[PDB]
Amino acid sequence: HMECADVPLLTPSSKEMMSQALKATFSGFTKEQQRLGIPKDPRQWTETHVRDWVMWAVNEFSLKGVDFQKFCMSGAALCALGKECFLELAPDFVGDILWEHLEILQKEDVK
Secondary structure, X not given: OOXXXXXXXXXXXXXXXXXXHHHHHHHHHHHHHHHHXXXXXXXXXXXXXXXXXXXXXXXXXXXXXXXXXXXXXOHHHHXXXXXXXXXXXXXXXXXXXXXXXXXXXXXXXXX
8 A cells, every 4th residue: 555665765666756746745635625624534525525635636646537427426435435446436547546545544534
């Protein structure tokens, strides 16, 4: 999930760059969560928070090909779907990023 055993020193790899973006995006999330009202816990989310986030995640990582029609549901539903289901809703590339940070919200905010 995100990064598995990585020590940034002298090992330039795409995996390190992937975490870099995610790490910097986090700070840009709370700034939006306060502007829109989106809570930290993904289970207490709704269609608006889901879409507003997805869209925001597309601007943070300049993603493309992701649709909000597939994510037209509340957080409780999105979480219930699981990684596989969520990955089926979003593209083969962007889907990973969203679920990466999305899953973090779950672990960070248990229940």
